[PDB]
Amino acid sequence: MTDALEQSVLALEGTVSVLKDSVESLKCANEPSTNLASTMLQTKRVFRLVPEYDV
Amino acid sequence: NTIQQLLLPKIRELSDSIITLDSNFTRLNFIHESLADLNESL
Amino acid sequence: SATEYRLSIGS
Amino acid sequence: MDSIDEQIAIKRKELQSLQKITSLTDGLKIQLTELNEQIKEMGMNADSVAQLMNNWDSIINNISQAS
Amino acid sequence: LGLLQYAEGDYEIGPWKDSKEDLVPLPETMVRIRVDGNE
Amino acid sequence: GESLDRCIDDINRAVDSMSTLYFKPPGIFHNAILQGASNKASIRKDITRLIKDCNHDEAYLLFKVNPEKQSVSRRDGKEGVFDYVIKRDTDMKRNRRLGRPGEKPIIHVPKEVYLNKDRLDLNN
C-alpha cells in the first residue's frame, strides 16, 4: 500500500514543482510586458469624428 | 429542417441537465429532512 | 450517474 | 485478534503520508492562485494592446467617412 | 406537549412561510416550582 | 421532430416535480435552541419564555410539595400530566429491573392524557 501512497506523493510533488517553475517563468516574462503596457501604451479616446453631413 | 436539427441537440443536453438537476434537488431534499431530524433530536 | 465537467465551446 | 503494533505501524505510515499529501495539496492550491493571477496580468496587457490597436479601425472609418 | 399545540401550518415561519409576530413554535412553556422547602 | 416534443415533455415533467418539492420547516426544539442563542437580548427573552417563576403562594396553595421526595402534587389530589409522566417512567424502570427491554423511542410524547382533556377543553 505504501507503494501507491509514495507514488501519489511523488506525482503531486512533481506537479507542485512544475507549477513553481511555470509561475516563476510566467512572472519573469510578464514583468517587462506589464512595465511597457501600463505606462506608455495607455490610450484615452476623448472624441469621435463626425461628418457634418449627418448633423 | 437541418437547422432545427442544429438546435435540437442543444435542447437535448438542456433536458439532460435539467433532469439531473431535478434528481439532485430531490436528493438534497432528503438530506435536508435528515438534517432537520438530527437538529430536532440534538 | 455523476455529472462531468464538460465545457462546451463553439458549434 | 491481529497484532496491534502491526496496525499501529500501518496507521502511522498512512498518517505521515497523508500529512505530506495535505501540505503538498496546499502548495498546489497556492500555485494555482498565483498562476491565475499571472494569467490575469497578461490578459490585462493584451487588452491594453487592443485598446491601442483600435485606432487603426478608427482611422479607416474616418477615411471612409471623409471620402 | 408543544408538539400538539401548533398545527402543521404554524411551523412555516420565516422562509418557509407560504407567501401567496406569528408566535413561532416553542415547546410548552414551563413554570419553575421551588422544592427545596424555602420561600 | 418528435425528439423535440419528447425533450420538451421531459423538461416540463422535471420542472413540475421540482416545483412540488417540500423542504421540512424547523421543528419545535430547534426554535427554542436557536432563538435562545440568537441575540444577547434574545437569550433573556427565550429564558423568560421557556421557564417562568410562579407565585410561590399560589403554587403552595395549589400543590403539595414533599421535601423528602422533593416531589410536587396537586393539593386536590387530582392526577395531572406530571403524574402520568412520572408513573410511566417508574413503571418502565420497574419493568427494566425485571429484565424487559427499554422503549426504542426514549422520549415518549404524552399524547393520550393531553389529548383526552385538551380536546374537551377546546370543545368547552
Next chain:
Amino acid sequence: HNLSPLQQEVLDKYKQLSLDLKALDETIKELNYSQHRQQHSQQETVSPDEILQEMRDIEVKIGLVGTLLKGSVYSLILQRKQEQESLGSNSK
C-alpha cells in the same frame, strides 16, 4: 430589404426567444454567483457556503456525535477480544 410577412413573424419571434434566452442565462448565472455578500446581495446562492465549506464544516464535527459513539463501543469490543484471545492462548 423587404421580407415576407411569415418571415417577419419568424424574425420577431426569434427576437423574443433571444430575449428570454439571455434572461434565463442571467438567472442561471445569478444562481451560480458565489458572490453571496460579495456583490450587493443578502440571499445565499448555491456555492461553497452551501457546499464543502459549509457541509464539510458540519461534517468535521458531526463525527463527534455519531461516529464517536460507535468508535468507543468498537474500542471496548476490541479490548475485550484482545483479553479473550490472550487468556485463551496463554491458558492452554
Next chain:
Amino acid sequence: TTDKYFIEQRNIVLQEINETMNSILNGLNGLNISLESSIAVGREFQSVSDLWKTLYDGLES
C-alpha cells in the same frame, strides 16, 4: 437577394443563440457538479440521523 438576407440574419441569430446556450449549459453543469458534491458529502448524515431517531422523533411514535 431578400431571401439571402433572411438567411444571413438566421445564421447570425442562430450562432449567438448557440453561444448563449453554450453558456447556459456550462453554468448548469458547474451547478450540478457542486450540487452532487453537496449530496456526496451529505449522504453520511442519514445514518447518524437514523441513530438519533431513537431518542426523539415526535410524530412517528
Next chain:
Amino acid sequence: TTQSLLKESESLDKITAMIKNVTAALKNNLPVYVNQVHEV
C-alpha cells in the same frame, strides 16, 4: 417552404413556453430552496 415555416413556428411556440417555465422555476423555486437548506 410554407409548411416548414408553420412547423418551425409551432416548435418555437413550444420552445418559448418551455423556457419561460424553466426560467420561472429557476428564478422562484430554487433560491428559496437553497436559502432554506443554508439556514438549516
Next chain:
Amino acid sequence: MENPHEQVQANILSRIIGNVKRLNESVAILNQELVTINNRNKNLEIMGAICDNYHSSVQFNLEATNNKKPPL
C-alpha cells in the same frame, strides 16, 4: 461489529477519486483551449516579426541617408 471508520474512509476516498477525476477533465479541457488559442494566434508572431523588420529597416535607411532629424 465492524470498525466504524472504515465506511467513512471509503466514502471520503470515493469522493476524493471523483473530484480528482473532475480535476483531470478540467485540466484536459484547459489544455485543449490553450492549444486552440496558440494555433489561432500563430499569425500574430508573423505580424509582429514583419512589423519589427519594417521598423528596423526604416531605421537603418534613416541611418544610411541622413534624413533622420532631431527629436522634439
Next chain:
Amino acid sequence: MNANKQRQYNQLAHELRELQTNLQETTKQLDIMSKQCNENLVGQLGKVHGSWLIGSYIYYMEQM
C-alpha cells in the same frame, strides 16, 4: 490492510499520475502562450505600433 482501501489508493495514484501528465502539458502550453504574448503581442506588434502612433501624434500635435 483493507483491500477496499487498497484499491481506492491504487485508483488515487493512477488519477494523480494522470493529473501530473496533464499539468506538464499545461505548463508547456502556458510557456508557449507567454512567449506569444510578451514577445509578439506587446514585444513586437505592440511596441512598433505604439511607437508609430505616438510619433504621428507628436508630429501632428506640433503641427497644431
Next chain:
Amino acid sequence: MDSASKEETLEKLDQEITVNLQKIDSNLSFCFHKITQDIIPHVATYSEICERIMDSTEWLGTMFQETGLV
C-alpha cells in the same frame, strides 16, 4: 507508557487520518473551483482579446499578403 492510552493513540491515528482526508478533499475542491471558475474564463477572455487584435489589424494583413504572396 499506558495501555488505555495506547488504544487511545490508535484512535488518535484514526482521527488524524480522517481529518487529513477531509483537509485534502477541501484543498482539491478549492483547486477545482479555481480552475473551472477563474483560470478557464480568463483564458477565454484572452482568446477574445487576441481575436480582436488580429481582427483590428487585418487591413495590414491583407496589404502584406497582396504584395508578399505570404
